[PDB]
Amino acid sequence: KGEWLPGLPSPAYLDGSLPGDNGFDPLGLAEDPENLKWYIQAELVNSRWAMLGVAGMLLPEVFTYLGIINVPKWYDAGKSEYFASSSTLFVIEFILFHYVEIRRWQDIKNPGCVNQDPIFKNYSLPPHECGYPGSVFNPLNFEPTLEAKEKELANGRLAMLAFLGFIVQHNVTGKGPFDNLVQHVADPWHNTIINTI
Amino acid sequence: MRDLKTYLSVAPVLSTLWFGALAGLLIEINRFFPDALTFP
Amino acid sequence: FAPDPNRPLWFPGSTPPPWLDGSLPADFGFDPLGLASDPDSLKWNVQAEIVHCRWAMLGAAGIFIPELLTKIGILNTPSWYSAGELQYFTDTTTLFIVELFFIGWAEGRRWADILKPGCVNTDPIFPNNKLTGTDVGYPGGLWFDPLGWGTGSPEKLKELRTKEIKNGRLAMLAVMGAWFQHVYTGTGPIDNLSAHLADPGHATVFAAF
Amino acid sequence: DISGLTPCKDSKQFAKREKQQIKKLESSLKLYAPESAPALALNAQIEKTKRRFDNYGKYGLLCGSDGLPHLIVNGDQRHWGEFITPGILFLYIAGWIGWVGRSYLIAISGEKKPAMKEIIIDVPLASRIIFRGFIWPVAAYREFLNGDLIAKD
Ligand code: CLA
Ligand code: CLA
Ligand SMILES: CC(/C=C/C=C(C)/C=C/[C@@]12O[C@]1(C)C[C@@H](O)CC2(C)C)=C\C=C\C=C(C)\C=C\C=C(C)\C=C\[C@@]12O[C@]1(C)C[C@@H](O)CC2(C)C
Ligand SMILES: CC(/C=C/C=C(C)/C=C/[C@@]12O[C@]1(C)C[C@@H](O)CC2(C)C)=C\C=C\C=C(C)\C=C\C=C(C)\C=C\[C@@]12O[C@]1(C)C[C@@H](O)CC2(C)C
Ligand SMILES: CCCCCCCS[C@@H]1O[C@H](CO)[C@@H](O)[C@H](O)[C@H]1O
């Protein structure tokens, strides 16, 4: 348990037991325990999705700048031609996620409902903690220590901020993240947010 | 000092300060962004 | 820092206000408007006066030392009044933003000190580096008191702080004096001093009509 | 276009209105020296009118048979900037105000004489509350599920 603002006392409901607790809740969103239980799951899933999203926007552009591969920009990959057309892909995504997210939601409502699979009733998910299924979802059997959860949450928060930065930078410059970085590092003192306004 | 701060927290004084700040903000927005019929 | 009821007053023959006691350095019983009636208000105002005094001392040095050396020829610095509108290695806006970041970190830690005395005396990165100060406004330590003059007897400390406060008050008056002199005379402060010394009977404020 | 209206970049009545406004402004210009301050002020008004009409042309507004812009509200995706986006921004500001008011009324309810904090406002408490409206949709939703929004009497 650290302090996000040295001097400010931590809120009472933030006990220092949860991973990633730095006493950061100035707007009192998590005062109700029922809201905090929901916000923990929301933070975990949003961080996990933002991690993959940021990797997907950044790394293929870095590898395109180096010449190893040639793929379109993240904001331009949408209107490319694939084997299945955008609408079919969206429908498939909607169906698959409508299944998996309701399966996940049943676990948030009550911890141990959907551990057993319907088709092969032999198998089942061992008892676990909410947001940390493990077993099949952790094939390499990495131990879920407090350090690992803290690292996951920190990297996820950094990833969400990176995603917001990507979106705002593309909206205000019209170019990709890595070329913005290259333009800034080329001449730092004349390529800033000020010179784009 | 304490009593004067208490008086400046009374409803009419706070109201005139708040609405003056709001009016100034709106006036400056209209001075720099005049004749707005839509939101581009 | 004990009460001093027989100290010289700003207005000889008057009675100092009860909240102005004499324990604070550079106390002359001057508070006609009762701006420091509350103890919290006095605590805040002491810190405000200290930071104003130090900033104005630095400002007075930066205006008056370089402009005296220009009139002698040891330096060729431009006028202080228009030094802000010159062109530098970067535009003024990014300089202001970088200054905002750095000074904001410093000022936020000072704010944390004001709100809660202990709070920020320890290095965030290297736990072993600590500030050795004790009173609010005097951080001490190797960074803000390398020579160790900041701590000592409870009698020489009071006069050492009184000198600082009075010098800061003088510099606070002097900075505004230079500003208004530049506004109303159109030339530098050392030019004003030399012109007044040449003709003290006429070269004054009234020499504008 | 929609409802028989024509875009204001095409309609001749819009241009005729713009020409007549400038002509009306230029008649008072004749009564002043070409270098005087009133002549400089009417010229600024002329430029303001030119900019206004050019903007109304560029934004893609529809004008009737009178040369005046007409608003489209039904929900057309090319006219969201006239009602939908401003309406969303208004609904965000008003909900902010309402939520900050509700939180302040709740915060002072449990006191000895809570009517004194309604005529003499506790400014620090208001400063604490005020910036909670930035996330007012999330909290307003969340007290709907739990049941802390509506008093069940
Ligand atoms: C900080 C001390 C200080 C000092 C030493 C001076 C000195 C001087 N000022 Mg000046 N001035 C000051 C503050 C000061 N000023 C302040 C705060 C203002 C803003 C109101 C001005 C506004 C000002 C104008 C507009 C003009 C001068 C001018 C002058 C010069 C002619 C004398 C005169 O007419 O004084 C006039 C003094 C005032 C109008 C107000 C001064 C009141 C201060 C605060 C009291 C200073 C005495 C005090 C006991 C401290 C003594 C310090 C000690 C070293 C003696 C002279 C070099 C004139 C000039 O340039 O000459 C050609 C001129 O035109 N001053
Ligand atoms: C906390 C502030 C607050 C809130 C949340 C509401 C909420 C509501 N009012 Mg209401 N009202 C308020 C203040 C408030 N009112 C005040 C001050 C008055 C006296 C002028 C009224 C007079 C009033 C009438 C006459 C009616 C409502 C109605 C309603 C309901 C429908 C919405 C509506 O018509 O709004 C319209 C709201 C107004 C016309 C008044 C708004 C006044 C300002 C904007 C509120 C300022 C609050 C405060 C000064 C700020 C707090 C600062 C604090 C942080 C220190 C809704 C439950 C209607 C209803 O019952 O139908 C369901 C209805 O008919 N209200
Ligand atoms: C999930 C996410 C992004 C996911 C991105 C994805 C999937 C991207 C996918 C793509 O790129 C690829 C892969 C390939 C491209 O070709 C296509 C697209 C589709 C473009 C972002 C979350 C982003 C989430 C963000 C940014 C959340 C920020 C929240 C903050 C800062 C809240 C802070 C507070 O709530 C606290 C913490 C405490 C309160 O007391 C105070 C406040 C301040 C209110
Ligand atoms: C005068 C002043 C305050 C005066 C206040 C007074 C008298 C108040 C008196 C009272 O309250 C009391 C005592 C008691 C009450 O009961 C009665 C009243 C009467 C109400 C502050 C000035 C304070 C002035 C300050 C802090 C000035 C700092 C200046 C700086 C840093 C300048 C820097 C530069 O000049 C350089 C260095 C180089 C240039 O090129 C660039 C720049 C940046 C321009
Ligand atoms: C800008 C936020 C802080 C503003 C503080 C202004 C004075 S705060 C003021 O203090 C009084 C006691 O002195 C109280 O009686 C009153 O309720 C309170 O509003």
User: Cβ A189–C90 below 8 Å, yes or no?
Assistant: yes
D120 close to B10: Cβ distance less than 8 angstroms: yes
B13 close to B4: Cβ distance less than 8 angstroms: no
Interface test with C, best of A5, A194, A196 (most C CBs within 10 A): A194
Cα separations in angstroms, B35 against D18, D49, D55, D82: 15, 9, 9, 13
Q: What angle do CA C65, C68, C70 make, to 5 degrees?
A: 110
CB-side neighbour CA atoms (13 Å) of A34: 10
Between CA A49 and CA A134 the distance in angstroms is 17
Q: Is C10 in the pocket of ligand 1 (CB under 6 A)?
A: no
Cα separations in angstroms, C136 against A7, B25, C3, C124, C187: 15, 38, 19, 19, 40
DSSP A108-170: HHSTTSS-B-SS-TT-BPPP-BTTB--GGG-TT-----HHHHHHHHHHHHHHHHHHHHHHHHH
* Ligand nearest to the CA of residue D122, numbered in listed order: 5
Q: Is C36 in the pocket of ligand 4 (CB under 6 A)?
A: no
Cα separations in angstroms, A154 against A23, A30, A41, A137, D102: 14, 19, 15, 21, 34
Report how this structure was experimentally obtained.
cryo-EM
D148 at A interface, C-beta within 8 A: yes
Q: Measure CA D45 to chain center.
A: 23
Tokens encoding C106: 């410093």
- Find residues 35-94 of chain A whose CB sits inside 8 Å of chain D: 35, 38
Report the SS3 class of residue D106: helix
Q: Which of C161, C178, C177 is nearest to C47 (CA)?
A: C161
Between CA A35 and CA A13 the distance in angstroms is 11
Kindly tell me the sign of the dihedral angle through the C-alpha atoms of C98, C101, C106, C110.
Answer: positive
Tokens encoding A44: 């975990």
Between CA C189 and CA D64 the distance in angstroms is 67
In chain D, which residues have their Cβ closer than 8 Å to the Cβ of B39? Answer: 81-82, 85-86, 89
User: Cβ C90–A7 below 8 Å, yes or no?
Assistant: no
Between CA C157 and CA A190 the distance in angstroms is 48
Resolution of the structure, angstroms? 2.4
Per-residue DSSP letter, D132: G
What residue type is B26 in one-letter code? L
Kindly tell me the sign of the dihedral angle through the C-alpha atoms of C96, C97, C100, C105.
Answer: negative
Q: Is D4 in the pocket of ligand 5 (CB under 6 A)?
A: no
Rg (CA), chain B: 16
- Find residues 1-20 of chain B whose CB sits inside 8 Å of chain C: 1-2
The residue of chain A nearest to residue C111, with distances taken between CA atoms, is A7
Residue with tokens 């009860």: C18
User: Cβ B35–D121 below 8 Å, yes or no?
Assistant: no
What residue type is A106 in one-letter code? Q
User: Cβ B37–D48 below 8 Å, yes or no?
Assistant: no
The residue of chain A nearest to residue C90, with distances taken between CA atoms, is A189
**Taking every pair of C-alpha atoms in chain B, what is the biggest distance, in angstroms?**
49
A114 close to A107: Cβ distance less than 8 angstroms: yes
Residue with tokens 């409901």: A13
Residue with tokens 């005395």: C117
How many angstroms separate the alpha carbon of residue C177 from the centre of ligand 1?
A: 6
Chains meeting C at 3+ CB pairs closer than 8 A?
A, B
Which segments within C130-175 are labelled E, that is strand? Answer: none
Q: CB atoms < 10 A from the CB of A28, how many?
A: 16
User: Cβ C119–A190 below 8 Å, yes or no?
Assistant: no
Atom of ligand 2 lying closest to residue D102 CA: 1
DSSP B1-40: -HHHHHHHTBHHHHHHHHHHHHHHHHHHHHHHS-S--S--
**Residues belonging to chain C with any Cβ–Cβ distance to chain B shorter than 8 Å:** 34-38, 41
User: Cβ D52–B35 below 8 Å, yes or no?
Assistant: yes
In chain B, which residues have their Cβ closer than 8 Å to the Cβ of D81? Answer: 38-40
Report the SS3 class of residue C179: helix
Q: Which of D48, D51, D86 sits opposite B39 (nearest CB)?
A: D86
Q: CB atoms < 10 A from the CB of B29, how many?
A: 11
Between CA D143 and CA D149 the distance in angstroms is 5
**Residue A7 burial by CB count (10 A; 0-12/13-18/19+): exposed, middle or buried?**
middle
B31 at C interface, C-beta within 8 A: no
B39 at D interface, C-beta within 8 A: yes
Q: What are phi and psi of D69, to 5 degrees?
A: -60, 145
Between CA A76 and CA D90 the distance in angstroms is 33
**Residue C168 burial by CB count (10 A; 0-12/13-18/19+): exposed, middle or buried?**
buried
In chain A, which residues have their Cβ closer than 8 Å to the Cβ of D142? Answer: 29, 32, 35, 38
Between CA C17 and CA C33 the distance in angstroms is 10
